[PDB]
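Batch manifest line 1958
LIGAND: zinc ion
JOB: complex structure
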Amino acid sequence: FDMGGYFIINGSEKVLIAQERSAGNIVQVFKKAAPSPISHVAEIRSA
Amino acid sequence: ASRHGQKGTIGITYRREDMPFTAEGIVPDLIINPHAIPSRMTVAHLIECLLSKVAALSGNEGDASPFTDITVEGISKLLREHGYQSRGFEVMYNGHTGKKLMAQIFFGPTYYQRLRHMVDDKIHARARGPMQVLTRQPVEGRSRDGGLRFGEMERDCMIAHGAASFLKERLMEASDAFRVHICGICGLMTVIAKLN
Amino acid sequence: EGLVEYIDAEEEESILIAMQPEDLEPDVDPAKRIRVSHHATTFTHCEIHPSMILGVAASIIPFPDHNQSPRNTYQSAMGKQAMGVFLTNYNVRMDTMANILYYPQKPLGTTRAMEYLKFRELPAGQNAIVAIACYSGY
Amino acid sequence: NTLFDDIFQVSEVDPGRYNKVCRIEAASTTQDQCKLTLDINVELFPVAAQDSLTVTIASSLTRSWRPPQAGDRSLADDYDYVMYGTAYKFEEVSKDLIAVYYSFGGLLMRLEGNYLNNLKQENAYLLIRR
Amino acid sequence: RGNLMGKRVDFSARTVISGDPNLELDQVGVPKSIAKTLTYPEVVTPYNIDRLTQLVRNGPNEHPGAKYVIRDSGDRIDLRYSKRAGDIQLQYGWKVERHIMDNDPVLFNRQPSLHKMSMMAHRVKVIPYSTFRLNLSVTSPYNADFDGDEMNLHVPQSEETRAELSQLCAVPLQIVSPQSNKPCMGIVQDTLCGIRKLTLRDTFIELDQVLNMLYWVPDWDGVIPTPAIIKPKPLWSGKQILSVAIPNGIHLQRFDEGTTLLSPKDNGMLIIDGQIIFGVVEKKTVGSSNGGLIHVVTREKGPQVCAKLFGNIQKVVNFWLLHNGFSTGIGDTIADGPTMREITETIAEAKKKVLDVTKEAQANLLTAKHGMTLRESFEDNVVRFLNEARDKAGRLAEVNLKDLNNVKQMVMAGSKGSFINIAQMSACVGQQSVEGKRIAFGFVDRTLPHFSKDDYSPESKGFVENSYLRGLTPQEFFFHAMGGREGLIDTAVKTAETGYIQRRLVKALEDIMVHYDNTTRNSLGNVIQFIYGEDGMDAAHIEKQSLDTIGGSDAAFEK
Amino acid sequence: ANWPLPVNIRRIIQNAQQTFHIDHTKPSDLTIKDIVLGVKDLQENLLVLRGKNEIIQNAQRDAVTLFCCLLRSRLATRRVLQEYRLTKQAFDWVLSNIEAQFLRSVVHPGEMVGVLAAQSIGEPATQMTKVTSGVPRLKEILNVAKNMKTPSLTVY
Amino acid sequence: KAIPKDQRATTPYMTKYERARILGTRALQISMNAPVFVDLEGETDPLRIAMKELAEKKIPLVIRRYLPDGSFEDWSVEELIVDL
Amino acid sequence: TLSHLRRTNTPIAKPRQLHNTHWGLVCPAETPEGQACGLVKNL
Amino acid sequence: YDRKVPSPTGEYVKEPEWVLETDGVNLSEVMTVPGIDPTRIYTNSFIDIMEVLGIEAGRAALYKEVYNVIASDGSYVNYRHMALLVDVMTTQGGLTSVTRHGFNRSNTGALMRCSFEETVEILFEAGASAELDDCRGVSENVILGQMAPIGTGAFDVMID
Amino acid sequence: EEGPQVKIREASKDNVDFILSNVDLAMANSLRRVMIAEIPTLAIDSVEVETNTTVLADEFIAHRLGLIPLQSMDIEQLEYSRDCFCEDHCDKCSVVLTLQAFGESESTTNVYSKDLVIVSNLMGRNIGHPIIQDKEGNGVLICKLRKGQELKLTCVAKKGIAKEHAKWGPAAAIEFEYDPWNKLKHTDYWYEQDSAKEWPQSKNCEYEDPPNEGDPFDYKAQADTFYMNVESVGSIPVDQVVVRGIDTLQKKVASILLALTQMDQD
Amino acid sequence: MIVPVRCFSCGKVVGDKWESYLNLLQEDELDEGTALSRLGLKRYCCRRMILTHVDLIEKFLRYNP
Amino acid sequence: MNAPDRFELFLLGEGESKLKIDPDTKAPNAVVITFEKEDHTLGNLIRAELLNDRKVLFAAYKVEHPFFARFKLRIQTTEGYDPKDALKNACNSIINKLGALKTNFETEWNLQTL
RNA sequence: AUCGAGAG
DNA sequence: ACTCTCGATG
Ligand SMILES: [Mg+2]
Ligand SMILES: [Zn+2]
Ligand SMILES: [Zn+2]
Ligand SMILES: [Zn+2]
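JOB STATUS: finished
ARTIFACT:
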């Protein structure tokens, strides 16, 4: 019944938890706050 | 706990004679209080009970799948077909006296699970034990035979009550109480107190 | 054979999914639930089965659609604290600490999703003859 | 001894969401200024509409209630339906109209008359026959 | 903050709590093991030298016993290892650390300790099993259930401090709280539902059961009350036998709606001289209300009599309820057929109105309310319509319920549950909301991929026509899931920010007290209030009284 | 009219017409002077501050003003004689009992009422579920919000 | 400096904290076999004995009530009224 | 075990909220409470 | 708004009036407008009340708002507590917040203020200015482990 | 006879369906309680495990050994181990039976209750023999052994009361119903529309006369007729279950009476 | 694990009824309800006791040690 | 762990007597009797059999706490009637009824088949 | 010491 | 910016 998908480090069963993040190479436009001098910012995280 | 976020500990155990009983002589393995129903709105608990009762009697496997066209009415009809109150109620008798109960009781099989929070693994008591080295206060942990933190909020409660002597007792005789020597001049702990 | 597709959210943005496969066809029972008639036509994909929106822990809950959602959440939290048989080889493993139920039992009310989670083979609880009643007050 | 004696005519019977106690509304067949409201255990002594019940108030027939032994004891009733209550209000409608409020373990009663020896006392035996 | 403002202490314990209907209010169930563990130092006096000698004779492991014996020199004798654990001549002045016994004053506590009632002094009743058993009516000030809740218990180590606990922190002394000038304890759950079930005019009790109930009261005069019914069968009413628990000289008067000294609905409440004249006893009376019976008995007869009253009421009502029974099934969530039809058609006409308003707004005929957007006006209207729908259907379901309906019975008693619970379980769970507005368009111009774009219909923006009895659709289920999610989130956030705010308030108003001139000052002597509370009264001894000089006409006033 | 005040006068009166078992058909053995001067002299004993200077006395009358209003309202001659029909003994008992209860209702010096207040406000904030209300609004208030989320102007 | 026995403004009634402190102190004295100034009459618990000893005003203690300025008023236990 | 092997963690506008796009990809009910609620999700 | 108003005959009668609610706040110029009652006008910003109508009006508004928050949930807290909080917030002359910027800058004991928020820096600046600790503060006696002047310890017991 | 009456409706080895006439409710209830809990029975109380290479844990096996129904016919001429003047246990108080099983064939070797072998001297008393109502003649399935798995242990059975442990329970479920027409009105029926059509009609309705709507409520009626069905487990025959129940209740009343006789001593 | 020797609720012996239950299932090709009915399991508590049970010992015997 | 022994439900402790007769101080000619190691099985029956005696004014039993196997039975009789005799008569009546029931059941059983 | 999971 | 309970790894 053991499904696996885990490692064995020093006899201890370890599980790598999936890490959530923002996708790269995506263009996103954001409205800045009121006290801010800039009104809009179109940014992109290049990977 | 059941299978609907209905958790709770054991209050007491009753032998089968003290337990309430149906005319069939069936005694409950478990008694829960109705007040844990309307405020939490776990209707599916009741539905599980009814379906599991019908499946128990008929000897089939009750389908409790999410989005299906299985209704309380059909289940009720099935339960009636097997010769019971369609809504799961059963006339029961008080075990102590043998006299009937006025209100009938919702009675039937329900899948309960035993959680891992048991008392003998939780229970703790300490009357003067091992202290820490840095602060000379009771150590942290039940397994290390430690004491319980008399928190800031506890202190505030004792202030609100007015029990000053108790507050002093908790903060000295109960925990770390130390005697130091002070110079009458600079007022620091410079004193080399060569006793005896 | 192009009968099933893999769709992520980004592509999910531009399709029209049918909830049930019976929503493609052109007096009732008051007992059942009020389901809105399909006011759409141009479908492109159809859901396999809505009950798959749940996770592994939530798929153990009987009639979760008849419950207040936070109760489903709480059960999803406490399902991971129930005892039973976690593995068949529990007697040949040397775990730090493990609890095994004396007499496990497959629930009388099950989900169709329990079939794949092997819960009917490895249950975690017992069918107790419950009674909702005010008794001794204990 | 006796404090009151009259015959009333049941004008209305009302089971206000009950099934063991009905509120009864009657009037005296002697005084055209006398009426009566009274909670009655229908399960024990059934009271239909348009009935002529004989009603009596007494002060005797404190100490603990001994079971009716044997008896072989002064019942001082031989009625059909007997209750014991407590007066708690003396409402004066007019100078020619005085009402009293009795409480028989919750089963209330409002007796409206004119001419009375009904003092605010625990003694209140209500005896009804026929 | 971790070692000075609050530090770990000895002579303390912690365990899972459980309820116990047969314990007095100011009592606490203490497991035998804990009783043997925690100890109290007692100086050898001529009054107790015998008892102490017996305790030392028992030693540890056996309760009641002793752990250590301190002599004059200050040497500690360990009774579990010493070679002279059997023969000890207790000299006067010696200390004997004995086990915690019955009627010892201990400090019961439950984190988080928000107010002073979170730490109250209880009497110890050493019991079997490993749980802290407490009285039901003390659940409220501690804010605790028994779904795994743990509580802490501290033990005083001198006469003066246990005097402090018994004379200041005692539970009966904390009954009427100076927080809301009202009692914070009362009759709840089974005792409340039961005391509602018992005080009905249909509730009659025959001889034997009456005798048992009578005997169940510890403060019973041993005098059988004359039955309300003499012939043809001697019967007692619930009110009648419940009157035994209520002390003499107790006058309680409360008028509800149609309460006219005759009360055709048996509502309101009239109680004269410890005898309930009429009215059904429930939350408005025996609960933790302002003009409640608990408040009256406390202020009149005293805290002890009031706690003993908790005891009595609980014992009797729990007995009667035990031999009467009460339950709840799915049948208590099933309204009649035609009722369900009216509910359905109500939802239908609601969605019809929403449809009409929608079509109107799309026709550019919708005139915006002054100070808001056309679309905002539309949203407001639709939401209001759906709310009125849920309330309409819900009230239909409530009206359809019978007086034998267990849910409705608990609602009546005020034990647990309310209208909306019935409304959602039986009729229609209503519109789901996230951040105020209804389910917004996660996907482009639509809430779910199963909808077409720009679909502002009720079912699309998260309206659930179905009830919990009927069952939710996938869309409805997911939207409801969103609502609940936000619920749990803002719940956690709320408990956090409150957690901080409480501490801030405490650390701000820390050193403020009333000096010996009724002047509220601090550590600097700075006057905050020249007279405390602007009147100089303690909040505990204050009740809401009417000022019948301020109202009425001048003619009525003069008259 | 309904406001939190010390000493429930109603319970005291209804206890008086029960302890002495007074009938509602009997002339009271009282005088106008008894009631008027009696009540007027009852207010003299309701002490909160016990100084001998003018300031403390003014603070005293200002402290007992409301409760004295209630006292006069309930113990008016017409009301005393006609509404309850109290006797001499019953009336004196009422006065003495009122004074006693008032003296009991005084706050005890040493009462750490700061912490009591902080908890009496902080605790009910825990059991909390169109302007901003609830916990965020409370947080704005305690922090003294320079820029509150929903500033409003109610104009009459 | 001090405050004369006349012109004392503090409450003539004993506060609950004063009562608790006195009962605790006296019970502490009794707990170490100190002479009792009243008839025991069966009572053995030092707290109960202290309570009975207070009810008969047989307690030779005094209360130094502190005013915020630095002044202080003395109130003998025999003189203080116990209405609680 | 099955549940743990399919878990999602999230570091650091409203990420806790059950977003519409979570439909069919993330369980709506299965999530911790009190602290990492909404942050920790299950597939 | 509905409103209870004394009728010329005596009894309080419901007399409904028109009241202008407003998103936006500028009390300094709205109350001087001809047409409205400049004595009953009110804003939910006790800051502006404190700036325009004085510190006492600011006190009243502050209590009004706090009481409004408490009673918004349907709960009830006695007057003296909220009055105490508001008073201690308003006795310094202005509006003192319940934070590290407000009351924590007061002229109280060093240990007391150090037992909250900014701990070490307080001890630093107290050590620099050479402050004197009265040790009549609660948390100070808590630190020193002495019986604080609290309720029971609010006096002295002697023998006569 | 002269007092309470019995009418046996059905009778078999496992069940007794009868009607109790002319009895107070409390006596019927008390009889039921005694029959359930306070009847003496022989069952495994001690287990001495020598070798255990089976899947099941030691005490796991010991538990289900305890529940095994043993012959308790002549249990009355057996004695409580706490009463006997012997060390631990002897032949006058306890019955010792061994269990020796081992995996032989390649197939799974089952271990039943028939494999238990009485060792101690019964000296005439019918006792200790494990009840086998099984058709094949095996009895209770105790354990399952593989190829080379061995289970060797020794059981010491002692006299016990079901009030101390449910393993000493001589009976299972006792059916109990009085007044199948609710003519006493001890139960307020829950309903949605009709009270009679929703609630099923009891079998025992055949043995009593239905109420007439023209008749008022009988407020002076008590509980006389009771319908009982006692089911045995096998350790003790049904008739002997109810009889020894009666004699037990009688004896424990007689003990109180005797105590009253004893309290008159100076 | 293995079939519970006696029913939890009442106390009826159901340990000798497992193999017979299996035979009534596979040999006579009956449904679970009728199989349970033939074994004298009238009450649904014992009926549950057998129907609900999962024989895990058969998987445990798959190991050699 | 802290659970009491099972035999403490029917086996008397050290020095614990079966019956404790106490003069009730409430009403005259009344008595409260403490039954040790007994439950409702005996209490309910004896109490119900005491109410049959028409020379008995009061008769009620109670179990102050389910943890402990003991119950208190209060009995009040008419003057000239010692309550112990009422208890004895009740007990003997019970025993007689039970004996008759045993005989009857036996005679009824001797007429059955299967 | 820190980190991780869980309990109200 | 509440008390607990364990587990890991330096
Ligand atoms: Mg909890
Ligand atoms: Zn120096
Ligand atoms: Zn022996
Ligand atoms: Zn069973």
